[PDB]
Protein backbone atom coordinates (compact mmCIF):
# COMPACT_ATOMS: atom_id res chain seq x y z
CA UNK A 1 0.00 0.00 0.00
CA UNK A 2 1.93 3.02 -1.33
CA UNK A 3 0.92 6.67 -1.21
CA UNK A 4 2.07 8.96 -4.02
CA UNK A 5 2.32 12.61 -2.89
CA UNK A 6 2.93 15.67 -5.02
CA UNK A 7 3.59 18.48 -2.58
CA UNK A 8 3.56 22.16 -3.59
CA UNK A 9 4.56 25.06 -1.34
CA UNK A 10 3.91 28.57 -2.58
CA UNK A 11 4.88 31.75 -0.70
CA UNK A 12 3.60 35.20 -1.73
CA UNK A 13 5.39 37.87 0.33
CA UNK A 14 3.73 40.86 -1.37
CA UNK A 15 2.20 41.90 -4.78
CA UNK A 16 5.54 41.47 -6.67
CA UNK A 17 7.29 38.43 -5.11
CA UNK A 18 6.49 34.75 -4.92
CA UNK A 19 8.12 31.38 -5.15
CA UNK A 20 6.75 27.94 -5.73
CA UNK A 21 8.67 24.77 -4.91
CA UNK A 22 7.56 21.15 -5.20
CA UNK A 23 8.75 17.69 -4.21
CA UNK A 24 7.24 14.27 -4.95
CA UNK A 25 7.24 11.19 -2.72
CA UNK A 26 6.31 7.56 -3.35
CA UNK A 27 6.02 6.17 0.15
CA UNK A 28 9.04 7.61 1.98
CA UNK A 29 11.31 7.87 -1.17
CA UNK A 30 11.63 11.16 -3.15
CA UNK A 31 11.02 10.77 -6.91
CA UNK A 32 10.95 14.38 -8.16
CA UNK A 33 11.89 17.91 -7.19
CA UNK A 34 10.89 21.13 -8.87
CA UNK A 35 12.63 24.24 -7.67
CA UNK A 36 11.26 27.73 -8.45
CA UNK A 37 14.66 28.35 -10.15
CA UNK A 38 14.23 25.46 -12.64
CA UNK A 39 12.13 25.53 -15.83
CA UNK A 40 11.87 21.73 -15.72
CA UNK A 41 11.02 19.03 -13.20
CA UNK A 42 14.09 17.10 -11.98
CA UNK A 43 14.17 13.34 -11.48
CA UNK A 44 15.74 12.32 -8.18
CA UNK A 45 15.66 8.60 -9.11
CA UNK A 46 16.70 6.85 -12.34
CA UNK A 47 13.13 5.38 -12.63
CA UNK A 48 11.27 8.69 -11.94
CA UNK A 49 9.83 8.78 -15.48
CA UNK A 50 8.06 5.49 -14.67
CA UNK A 51 6.65 3.70 -17.73
CA UNK A 52 5.90 6.98 -19.54
CA UNK A 53 7.48 7.40 -22.98
CA UNK A 54 9.48 10.58 -23.50
CA UNK A 55 6.58 12.11 -25.46
CA UNK A 56 4.04 11.47 -22.68
CA UNK A 57 6.46 12.93 -20.12
CA UNK A 58 7.08 16.12 -22.18
CA UNK A 59 3.32 16.70 -22.57
CA UNK A 60 2.82 16.21 -18.84
CA UNK A 61 5.76 18.43 -17.91
CA UNK A 62 4.41 21.08 -20.28
CA UNK A 63 1.00 21.04 -18.56
CA UNK A 64 2.75 21.56 -15.18
CA UNK A 65 4.88 24.36 -16.60
CA UNK A 66 1.76 26.25 -17.71
CA UNK A 67 0.06 25.45 -14.40
CA UNK A 68 2.87 26.95 -12.31
CA UNK A 69 2.87 30.33 -14.14
CA UNK A 70 -0.95 30.39 -14.19
CA UNK A 71 -1.39 29.38 -10.55
CA UNK A 72 0.89 32.24 -9.60
CA UNK A 73 -1.06 34.86 -11.46
CA UNK A 74 -4.32 33.42 -10.21
CA UNK A 75 -3.45 33.68 -6.50
CA UNK A 76 -2.23 37.27 -6.98
CA UNK A 77 -5.48 38.02 -8.75
CA UNK A 78 -7.67 36.30 -6.15
CA UNK A 79 -5.95 38.50 -3.53
CA UNK A 80 -7.05 41.59 -5.50
CA UNK A 81 -10.60 40.19 -5.57
CA UNK A 82 -10.91 39.69 -1.76
CA UNK A 83 -9.02 42.74 -0.46
CA UNK A 84 -8.79 44.55 1.85
CA UNK A 85 -10.13 41.48 3.82
CA UNK A 86 -7.33 39.02 2.91
CA UNK A 87 -3.75 40.14 2.26
CA UNK A 88 -0.02 39.25 2.06
CA UNK A 89 2.06 37.41 3.20
CA UNK A 90 0.37 34.21 1.96
CA UNK A 91 1.46 30.56 2.18
CA UNK A 92 -0.36 28.02 0.00
CA UNK A 93 0.27 24.27 0.19
CA UNK A 94 -1.06 21.59 -2.17
CA UNK A 95 -1.03 17.88 -1.55
CA UNK A 96 -2.17 15.85 -4.53
CA UNK A 97 -1.77 12.28 -5.66
CA UNK A 98 -3.08 8.83 -5.07
CA UNK A 99 -3.01 5.89 -2.66
CA UNK A 100 -2.50 2.51 -4.41
CA UNK A 101 -4.35 -0.59 -3.19
CA UNK A 102 -4.00 -4.21 -4.42
CA UNK A 103 -5.56 -5.11 -7.77
CA UNK A 104 -6.22 -1.99 -9.87
CA UNK A 105 -7.84 0.03 -6.99
CA UNK A 106 -6.91 3.59 -5.93
CA UNK A 107 -8.14 6.79 -4.27
CA UNK A 108 -6.89 10.07 -5.69
CA UNK A 109 -6.83 13.32 -3.72
CA UNK A 110 -6.13 17.05 -4.12
CA UNK A 111 -6.01 19.05 -0.87
CA UNK A 112 -5.20 22.73 -0.56
CA UNK A 113 -4.13 24.57 2.62
CA UNK A 114 -4.13 28.32 3.20
CA UNK A 115 -1.87 29.82 5.92
CA UNK A 116 -1.29 26.27 7.23
CA UNK A 117 -4.96 25.12 7.36
CA UNK A 118 -6.68 22.62 5.09
CA UNK A 119 -9.50 24.63 3.44
CA UNK A 120 -10.23 23.37 -0.09
CA UNK A 121 -10.20 20.10 -2.03
CA UNK A 122 -11.03 18.89 -5.50
CA UNK A 123 -13.83 16.33 -5.20
CA UNK A 124 -15.77 14.74 -8.03
CA UNK A 125 -15.88 17.40 -10.75
CA UNK A 126 -15.32 20.55 -8.69
CA UNK A 127 -13.53 22.50 -6.00
CA UNK A 128 -15.19 22.74 -2.62
CA UNK A 129 -14.43 24.06 0.83
CA UNK A 130 -14.14 21.57 3.68
CA UNK A 131 -15.65 21.96 7.18
CA UNK A 132 -14.10 24.82 9.20
CA UNK A 133 -13.21 26.90 6.13
CA UNK A 134 -13.99 30.60 6.32
CA UNK A 135 -16.99 31.60 4.25
CA UNK A 136 -15.10 34.24 2.13
CA UNK A 137 -13.58 31.33 0.17
CA UNK A 138 -17.00 30.76 -1.46
CA UNK A 139 -16.15 33.51 -4.02
CA UNK A 140 -12.74 32.03 -5.05
CA UNK A 141 -14.39 28.56 -5.23
CA UNK A 142 -17.14 30.02 -7.42
CA UNK A 143 -14.52 31.59 -9.71
CA UNK A 144 -12.34 28.45 -9.85
CA UNK A 145 -15.43 26.30 -10.57
CA UNK A 146 -16.31 28.59 -13.50
CA UNK A 147 -13.16 27.27 -15.31
CA UNK A 148 -14.52 24.17 -17.11
CA UNK A 149 -11.19 23.41 -18.84
CA UNK A 150 -9.17 23.26 -15.60
CA UNK A 151 -11.90 21.00 -14.17
CA UNK A 152 -11.72 18.52 -17.08
CA UNK A 153 -7.90 18.51 -16.88
CA UNK A 154 -7.79 18.00 -13.09
CA UNK A 155 -10.40 15.22 -13.35
CA UNK A 156 -8.28 13.40 -15.94
CA UNK A 157 -5.19 13.94 -13.75
CA UNK A 158 -6.81 12.53 -10.64
CA UNK A 159 -8.91 9.72 -12.15
CA UNK A 160 -6.64 8.34 -14.90
CA UNK A 161 -3.14 9.86 -15.06
CA UNK A 162 -2.11 9.45 -11.36
CA UNK A 163 -3.02 5.79 -10.96
CA UNK A 164 -1.59 4.80 -14.36
CA UNK A 165 1.69 6.69 -13.74
CA UNK A 166 2.15 5.31 -10.23
CA UNK A 167 1.53 1.68 -11.31
CA UNK A 168 4.39 2.19 -13.77
CA UNK A 169 6.60 3.75 -11.07
CA UNK A 170 6.07 0.76 -8.73
CA UNK A 171 7.25 -1.52 -11.54
CA UNK A 172 10.24 0.63 -12.64
CA UNK A 173 11.40 1.39 -9.08
CA UNK A 174 10.75 -2.06 -7.58
CA UNK A 175 14.31 -2.74 -6.47
CA UNK A 176 14.72 0.67 -4.78
CA UNK A 177 11.31 0.31 -3.13
CA UNK A 178 11.93 -3.21 -1.82
CA UNK A 179 15.50 -2.50 -0.61
CA UNK A 180 16.75 -3.83 2.74
CA UNK A 181 19.37 -1.84 4.74
CA UNK A 182 20.76 -3.07 8.08
CA UNK A 183 20.50 -1.05 11.30
CA UNK A 184 23.70 -0.53 13.25
CA UNK A 185 23.16 0.12 16.96
CA UNK A 186 25.17 1.72 19.77
CA UNK A 187 24.67 2.74 23.42
CA UNK A 188 25.21 5.84 25.57
CA UNK A 189 23.91 7.64 28.71
CA UNK A 190 23.15 10.97 30.45
CA UNK A 191 19.99 8.58 34.93
CA UNK A 192 18.87 7.84 31.30
CA UNK A 193 20.23 5.16 28.91
CA UNK A 194 19.97 5.54 25.10
CA UNK A 195 19.99 2.88 22.37
CA UNK A 196 20.77 4.49 18.99
CA UNK A 197 19.66 2.54 15.90
CA UNK A 198 20.65 3.93 12.48
CA UNK A 199 20.93 2.91 8.82
CA UNK A 200 17.75 0.80 8.50
CA UNK A 201 15.18 0.61 5.70
CA UNK A 202 12.26 0.14 5.51
CA UNK A 203 10.74 2.06 8.45
CA UNK A 204 9.15 -0.89 10.41
CA UNK A 205 11.55 -1.69 13.31
CA UNK A 206 11.30 -3.01 16.89
CA UNK A 207 13.60 -1.79 19.69
CA UNK A 208 13.36 -2.63 23.41
CA UNK A 209 15.57 -2.56 26.51
CA UNK A 210 15.82 -5.95 28.27
CA UNK A 211 17.26 -7.81 31.27
CA UNK A 212 18.06 -11.29 29.91
CA UNK A 213 14.71 -12.01 28.24
CA UNK A 214 12.38 -9.58 30.04
CA UNK A 215 11.08 -6.52 28.12
CA UNK A 216 11.75 -3.39 30.20
CA UNK A 217 8.39 -1.64 29.94
CA UNK A 218 9.81 1.82 30.82
CA UNK A 219 11.33 1.97 27.27
CA UNK A 220 10.37 5.18 25.38
CA UNK A 221 11.07 5.13 21.63
CA UNK A 222 11.53 8.58 20.07
CA UNK A 223 10.48 9.66 16.58
CA UNK A 224 11.72 8.22 13.30
CA UNK A 225 14.40 10.67 12.07
CA UNK A 226 15.72 10.66 8.50
CA UNK A 227 19.31 10.17 7.37
CA UNK A 228 20.61 11.93 4.20
CA UNK A 229 21.03 8.55 2.37
CA UNK A 230 17.35 7.45 2.54
CA UNK A 231 17.68 5.31 5.65
CA UNK A 232 16.15 5.86 9.09
CA UNK A 233 17.32 6.71 12.58
CA UNK A 234 15.58 5.87 15.88
CA UNK A 235 16.56 6.11 19.55
CA UNK A 236 15.05 4.13 22.43
CA UNK A 237 15.63 5.58 25.93
CA UNK A 238 15.18 4.17 29.48
CA UNK A 239 15.25 5.90 32.89
CA UNK A 240 17.24 3.89 35.46
CA UNK A 241 18.74 4.18 38.94
CA UNK A 242 22.48 4.98 39.07
CA UNK A 243 24.38 1.70 39.66
CA UNK A 244 21.46 -0.42 38.30
CA UNK A 245 22.74 -0.85 34.71
CA UNK A 246 24.28 -4.35 35.04
CA UNK A 247 22.67 -6.93 32.70
CA UNK A 248 20.54 -4.42 30.71
CA UNK A 249 20.66 -5.01 26.94
CA UNK A 250 19.20 -3.35 23.84
CA UNK A 251 17.52 -5.75 21.39
CA UNK A 252 16.77 -4.66 17.81
CA UNK A 253 14.57 -6.54 15.31
CA UNK A 254 14.39 -5.56 11.64
CA UNK A 255 13.48 -7.29 8.35
CA UNK A 256 16.99 -6.73 6.95
CA UNK A 257 18.62 -8.88 9.69
CA UNK A 258 16.90 -12.16 8.63
CA UNK A 259 16.47 -13.61 12.13
CA UNK A 260 19.91 -12.56 13.47
CA UNK A 261 18.86 -9.84 15.92
CA UNK A 262 21.23 -7.22 17.33
CA UNK A 263 21.75 -7.55 21.08
CA UNK A 264 23.98 -4.99 22.84
CA UNK A 265 24.75 -5.48 26.56
CA UNK A 266 25.77 -2.50 28.74
Amino acid at each position, epitope marked *: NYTFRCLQMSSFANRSWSRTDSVVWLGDLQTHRWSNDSATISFTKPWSQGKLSNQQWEKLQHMFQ*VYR*V*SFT*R*DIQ*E*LV*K*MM*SPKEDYPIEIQLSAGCEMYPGNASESFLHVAFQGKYVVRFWGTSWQTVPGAPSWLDLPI*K*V*LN*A*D*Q*G*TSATVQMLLNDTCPLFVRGLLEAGKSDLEKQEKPVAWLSSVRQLVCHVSGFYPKPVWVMWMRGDQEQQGTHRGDFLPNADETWYLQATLDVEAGEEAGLACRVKHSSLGGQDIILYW
Partner: T-cell receptor
Amino acid sequence: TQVEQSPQSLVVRQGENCVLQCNYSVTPDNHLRWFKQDTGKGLVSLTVLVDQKDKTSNGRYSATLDKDAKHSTLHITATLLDDTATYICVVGDRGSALGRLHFGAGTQLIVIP
Amino acid sequence: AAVTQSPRNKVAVTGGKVTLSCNQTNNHNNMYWYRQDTGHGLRLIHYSYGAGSTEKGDIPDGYKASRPSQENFSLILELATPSQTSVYFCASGDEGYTQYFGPGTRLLVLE
Protein backbone atom coordinates in the same frame (compact mmCIF):
# COMPACT_ATOMS: atom_id res chain seq x y z
CA THR B 1 1.90 41.93 -29.37
CA GLN B 2 0.84 38.30 -28.93
CA VAL B 3 -2.11 38.36 -31.38
CA GLU B 4 -1.54 39.05 -35.11
CA GLN B 5 -4.10 39.32 -37.87
CA SER B 6 -3.71 38.95 -41.62
CA PRO B 7 -4.54 40.44 -44.06
CA GLN B 8 -4.40 43.95 -42.56
CA SER B 9 -6.94 45.06 -45.14
CA LEU B 10 -8.69 43.64 -48.18
CA VAL B 11 -11.18 44.71 -50.84
CA VAL B 12 -13.65 42.18 -52.29
CA ARG B 13 -16.73 42.33 -54.49
CA GLN B 14 -20.22 41.42 -53.31
CA GLY B 15 -20.86 37.67 -53.48
CA GLU B 16 -17.20 36.66 -53.15
CA ASN B 17 -15.96 34.65 -50.16
CA CYS B 18 -13.01 35.64 -47.97
CA VAL B 19 -10.80 34.21 -45.26
CA LEU B 20 -9.42 36.14 -42.32
CA GLN B 21 -6.43 34.79 -40.34
CA CYS B 22 -5.51 35.13 -36.66
CA ASN B 23 -2.21 33.86 -35.23
CA TYR B 24 -1.24 34.12 -31.59
CA SER B 25 1.48 33.33 -29.03
CA VAL B 26 -0.81 33.80 -25.96
CA THR B 27 -0.28 31.10 -23.24
CA PRO B 28 -2.48 29.50 -22.08
CA ASP B 29 -5.24 29.83 -24.69
CA ASN B 30 -8.65 29.00 -23.25
CA HIS B 31 -10.79 30.44 -26.05
CA LEU B 32 -10.81 32.71 -29.09
CA ARG B 33 -13.55 35.18 -30.03
CA TRP B 34 -14.19 36.94 -33.31
CA PHE B 35 -15.77 40.42 -33.15
CA LYS B 36 -17.28 42.58 -35.92
CA GLN B 37 -16.88 46.37 -35.55
CA ASP B 38 -18.69 48.71 -37.98
CA THR B 39 -17.18 52.18 -38.39
CA GLY B 40 -17.94 54.29 -35.29
CA LYS B 41 -19.74 51.40 -33.61
CA GLY B 42 -18.96 48.76 -31.00
CA LEU B 43 -18.07 45.14 -30.71
CA VAL B 44 -20.55 42.55 -31.93
CA SER B 45 -19.47 38.97 -31.11
CA LEU B 46 -19.63 36.60 -34.13
CA THR B 47 -18.50 33.32 -32.55
CA VAL B 48 -16.43 31.82 -29.75
CA LEU B 49 -14.14 28.82 -30.25
CA VAL B 50 -13.10 26.83 -27.18
CA ASP B 51 -11.87 23.30 -28.16
CA GLN B 52 -8.40 22.08 -29.18
CA LYS B 53 -9.65 21.53 -32.75
CA ASP B 54 -12.88 23.54 -32.97
CA LYS B 55 -15.31 24.59 -35.69
CA THR B 56 -18.26 26.99 -35.50
CA SER B 57 -20.84 28.50 -37.80
CA ASN B 58 -23.20 31.43 -37.54
CA GLY B 59 -25.03 32.00 -40.75
CA ARG B 60 -22.58 33.10 -43.41
CA TYR B 61 -19.72 33.12 -40.94
CA SER B 62 -17.77 30.04 -40.14
CA ALA B 63 -14.60 29.67 -38.10
CA THR B 64 -11.93 27.18 -37.09
CA LEU B 65 -9.37 26.98 -34.27
CA ASP B 66 -6.31 24.79 -33.97
CA LYS B 67 -4.63 25.26 -30.57
CA ASP B 68 -1.51 23.25 -31.48
CA ALA B 69 -0.76 25.70 -34.30
CA LYS B 70 -2.25 28.73 -32.42
CA HIS B 71 -4.19 29.67 -35.47
CA SER B 72 -7.79 30.66 -36.26
CA THR B 73 -9.57 31.52 -39.51
CA LEU B 74 -12.88 33.33 -40.01
CA HIS B 75 -14.61 32.48 -43.32
CA ILE B 76 -17.32 34.85 -44.66
CA THR B 77 -19.44 33.22 -47.39
CA ALA B 78 -21.07 35.35 -50.10
CA THR B 79 -20.10 38.82 -48.87
CA LEU B 80 -22.62 41.67 -48.61
CA LEU B 81 -22.12 45.42 -48.37
CA ASP B 82 -22.86 45.38 -44.59
CA ASP B 83 -19.78 43.14 -44.00
CA THR B 84 -17.73 46.27 -44.61
CA ALA B 85 -16.09 46.51 -41.20
CA THR B 86 -13.06 45.67 -39.08
CA TYR B 87 -12.91 42.08 -37.80
CA ILE B 88 -11.13 41.51 -34.51
CA CYS B 89 -9.61 38.40 -33.02
CA VAL B 90 -9.47 38.08 -29.18
CA VAL B 91 -7.77 35.34 -27.12
CA GLY B 92 -8.82 34.72 -23.51
CA ASP B 93 -6.15 33.13 -21.35
CA ARG B 94 -8.50 31.67 -18.70
CA GLY B 95 -11.87 29.97 -18.56
CA SER B 96 -12.90 32.48 -15.85
CA ALA B 97 -12.97 36.18 -14.92
CA LEU B 98 -9.37 35.70 -13.73
CA GLY B 99 -8.37 35.80 -17.45
CA ARG B 100 -7.03 38.70 -19.46
CA LEU B 101 -8.14 39.26 -23.06
CA HIS B 102 -5.47 39.71 -25.73
CA PHE B 103 -6.81 41.74 -28.69
CA GLY B 104 -5.60 41.71 -32.29
CA ALA B 105 -5.46 45.04 -34.10
CA GLY B 106 -8.06 43.81 -36.65
CA THR B 107 -8.47 43.25 -40.38
CA GLN B 108 -10.25 45.94 -42.38
CA LEU B 109 -12.71 44.42 -44.94
CA ILE B 110 -14.31 46.47 -47.72
CA VAL B 111 -17.04 44.91 -49.85
CA ILE B 112 -17.76 46.63 -53.19
CA PRO B 113 -21.49 46.35 -54.01
CA ALA C 1 -26.51 41.65 -20.05
CA ALA C 2 -26.36 45.39 -21.07
CA VAL C 3 -23.72 48.04 -20.31
CA THR C 4 -24.01 51.80 -20.88
CA GLN C 5 -21.40 54.54 -21.16
CA SER C 6 -21.62 58.29 -20.84
CA PRO C 7 -20.89 60.67 -22.30
CA ARG C 8 -20.85 59.02 -25.73
CA ASN C 9 -18.69 61.76 -27.26
CA LYS C 10 -16.54 64.48 -25.64
CA VAL C 11 -14.29 67.40 -26.66
CA ALA C 12 -11.89 68.51 -23.89
CA VAL C 13 -8.97 70.87 -23.35
CA THR C 14 -5.40 69.97 -22.28
CA GLY C 15 -5.09 70.27 -18.49
CA GLY C 16 -8.86 69.81 -18.01
CA LYS C 17 -10.60 67.14 -15.94
CA VAL C 18 -12.52 64.45 -17.81
CA THR C 19 -14.67 61.71 -16.28
CA LEU C 20 -15.94 58.79 -18.29
CA SER C 21 -18.67 56.79 -16.65
CA CYS C 22 -19.91 53.28 -17.17
CA ASN C 23 -23.19 51.94 -15.82
CA GLN C 24 -24.17 48.28 -15.59
CA THR C 25 -27.43 46.79 -14.10
CA ASN C 26 -26.48 43.05 -14.34
CA ASN C 27 -25.14 42.81 -10.78
CA HIS C 28 -21.70 41.89 -12.18
CA ASN C 29 -18.87 42.18 -9.66
CA ASN C 30 -16.24 42.85 -12.31
CA MET C 31 -15.68 45.89 -14.54
CA TYR C 32 -12.97 46.81 -17.02
CA TRP C 33 -11.84 49.91 -18.94
CA TYR C 34 -10.12 49.69 -22.30
CA ARG C 35 -8.91 52.18 -24.94
CA GLN C 36 -8.87 51.59 -28.73
CA ASP C 37 -6.29 53.32 -30.99
CA THR C 38 -5.55 52.65 -34.65
CA GLY C 39 -2.88 50.02 -35.29
CA HIS C 40 -3.42 48.47 -31.81
CA GLY C 41 -5.94 46.08 -30.31
CA LEU C 42 -7.95 47.21 -27.28
CA ARG C 43 -5.67 47.72 -24.24
CA LEU C 44 -6.67 47.40 -20.59
CA ILE C 45 -6.28 50.58 -18.49
CA HIS C 46 -7.93 49.81 -15.12
CA TYR C 47 -10.31 47.18 -13.75
CA SER C 48 -12.32 46.38 -10.63
CA TYR C 49 -13.48 43.26 -8.80
CA GLY C 50 -16.06 45.18 -6.72
CA ALA C 51 -17.13 48.40 -5.02
CA GLY C 52 -14.06 50.12 -3.49
CA SER C 53 -11.56 48.07 -5.56
CA THR C 54 -9.68 49.46 -8.51
CA GLU C 55 -6.67 47.73 -10.12
CA LYS C 56 -4.00 48.84 -12.53
CA GLY C 57 -4.23 47.25 -16.00
CA ASP C 58 -1.53 47.31 -18.72
CA ILE C 59 -1.54 51.08 -19.45
CA PRO C 60 -2.82 52.84 -16.30
CA ASP C 61 -0.59 55.96 -16.51
CA GLY C 62 -2.60 59.23 -16.72
CA TYR C 63 -5.84 57.62 -15.51
CA LYS C 64 -7.42 57.20 -12.11
CA ALA C 65 -10.32 54.75 -11.71
CA SER C 66 -13.21 54.79 -9.27
CA ARG C 67 -15.71 52.12 -8.25
CA PRO C 68 -18.23 53.85 -5.90
CA SER C 69 -20.87 51.12 -6.33
CA GLN C 70 -21.56 47.75 -8.01
CA GLU C 71 -23.34 49.62 -10.82
CA ASN C 72 -20.82 52.38 -11.65
CA PHE C 73 -17.17 52.34 -12.72
CA SER C 74 -15.52 55.63 -13.70
CA LEU C 75 -12.37 56.55 -15.57
CA ILE C 76 -11.00 59.88 -14.40
CA LEU C 77 -8.39 61.87 -16.38
CA GLU C 78 -7.29 64.57 -13.92
CA LEU C 79 -4.88 66.42 -16.26
CA ALA C 80 -6.12 65.44 -19.74
CA THR C 81 -3.49 65.35 -22.51
CA PRO C 82 -3.75 64.96 -26.35
CA SER C 83 -2.27 61.42 -26.10
CA GLN C 84 -5.55 60.42 -24.37
CA THR C 85 -7.54 61.12 -27.58
CA SER C 86 -9.02 57.64 -28.19
CA VAL C 87 -12.17 55.51 -28.16
CA TYR C 88 -12.82 54.14 -24.66
CA PHE C 89 -14.69 50.90 -24.06
CA CYS C 90 -16.06 49.72 -20.74
CA ALA C 91 -17.05 46.15 -19.92
CA SER C 92 -18.55 44.05 -17.16
CA GLY C 93 -18.66 40.37 -16.21
CA ASP C 94 -19.47 37.81 -13.53
CA GLU C 95 -17.15 34.92 -12.54
CA GLY C 96 -17.22 33.59 -16.14
CA TYR C 97 -14.73 34.66 -18.84
CA THR C 98 -17.25 36.66 -20.96
CA GLN C 99 -16.87 40.44 -20.92
CA TYR C 100 -19.90 42.44 -22.16
CA PHE C 101 -18.81 45.67 -23.82
CA GLY C 102 -20.41 49.10 -23.75
CA PRO C 103 -20.90 51.04 -27.03
CA GLY C 104 -17.74 53.15 -26.71
CA THR C 105 -16.93 56.78 -25.92
CA ARG C 106 -14.99 59.05 -28.32
CA LEU C 107 -12.61 61.48 -26.62
CA LEU C 108 -10.71 64.29 -28.37
CA VAL C 109 -8.30 66.32 -26.24
CA LEU C 110 -7.43 69.62 -27.98
CA GLU C 111 -4.46 71.82 -27.07
